[model samples]
Target: KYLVLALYDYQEKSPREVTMKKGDILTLLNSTNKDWWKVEVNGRQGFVPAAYVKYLD
Candidate 1:
C-alpha cells in the first residue's frame, strides 16, 4: 500500500501543494504511470500515488 500525505503548506523541497477542498476529485495529469492520481483537499490539487488509496470493495 502507498501513503498520501497532505501538504499543509508550501516549503522548500516539499511536494507542491494543491488548492482544493474536501470531497473534491483531482485528475492526474503527469505521473510515472497513468495509474497515478491527483488528490483534492482544502481547495488544492496534488499528486498522490495510486497504490496508497484504498478502494471500496
Candidate 2:
C-alpha cells in the first residue's frame, strides 16, 4: 500500500533520498528515524526526508 505522496520532485542525492516526482505514490516501509524514512517507489527503495511527504490515512 502506497500511502505516501511526494510533495515535490527530488532527484536522487545518494545515501539520502531517492529520485521521485510530485504526486508519486510510495509505500512507507520504515519510519523509525526522526527525520528520515525508508520508502519503496515503484520497485526501488530509499530514504526521504520526513517533511517531504503527506501521510495518508
The best candidate in terms of TM-score: 2
Q: Candidate 1 lDDT, tens digit per residue, 1-57?
A: 332442233222337534432333344444455544565544556655454443322
lDDT of 2 by residue, 1-57 (tens): 647988987777877568878899889989888788888887889998878887888
Error of 2 at 43 (Å): 0.8
Q: What Cα-based lDDT does every candidate model obtain?
A: 0.43, 0.83
Pairs with steric clashes in candidate 1:
2-52, 18-44, 18-45, 19-43, 19-44, 19-45, 20-42, 20-43, 20-44, 21-43
* TM-score for each candidate, following the candidate numbering: 0.36, 0.85
Q: Which ten residues in a row have the lowest lDDT in candidate 1?
A: 3-12
Give residue 25's lDDT in candidate 2 (0 to 100). 88
Candidate 2 weakest ten by summed lDDT? 8-17
Clashes of 2: 0
Residue pairs in candidate 2 whose N, alpha carbon or C atoms collide under 3 angstroms: none
